[PDB]
Amino acid sequence: ENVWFSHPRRYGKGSRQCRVCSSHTGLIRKYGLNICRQCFREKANDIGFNKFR
């Protein structure tokens, strides 16, 4: 019944989670996207990224 324990999570994989997915693994931190590799392909054209080459 103490302070609900939550000990430092301020860097590495288990610091930040996918914006939507809540996944720790396969994040794009690039341009502060913070979206998972899979979730990003689903929301590619949504955010503006479309393939040309």
């Binding site: 914006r19 939507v20 341009y31 502060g32 996207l33 979206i35 929301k43 949504d46 955010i47 503006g48």
Partner: protein
């Protein structure tokens, strides 16, 4: 401000993506064919391209007022800096999203 344009377009790009998925989850039963965000001085106008507006607005602009306060408190906008409009769906039959949701509802209503 100050946030780099390189990043800031992607930042409000992801805003559109979260908006599209919020209304695709909530206002999918009254029809929905996408959103539009127009950025103005002292105003960002989000316009819902949905079907029957007599239920999308709700009654007397009740539901859209409740959507306005929801989308506002989400991105911590000041009351008045963002407005919700409800457009008509230009030739409903082409809206692939509107056909998909309406069929999904037909299949959940026990239909071959």
């Amino acid at each position: 401000a100050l946030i780099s344009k390189k990043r800031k377009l992607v930042a409000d790009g992801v805003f559109y993506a979260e908006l599209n998925e919020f209304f695709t989850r909530e206002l999918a039963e009254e029809g929905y064919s996408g959103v539009e965000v127009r950025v103005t001085p002292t105003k960002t106008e989000v316009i819902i391209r949905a079907t029957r507006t007599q239920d999308v607005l709700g009654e007397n602009g009740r539901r859209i007022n409740e959507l306005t306060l929801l989308v506002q408190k989400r991105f911590k906008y000041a009351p008045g800096t963002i407005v919700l409009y409800a457009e008509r769906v230009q030739d409903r039959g082409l809206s692939a999203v509107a056909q998909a949701e309406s069929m999904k509802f037909k299949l959940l209503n026990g239909l071959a």
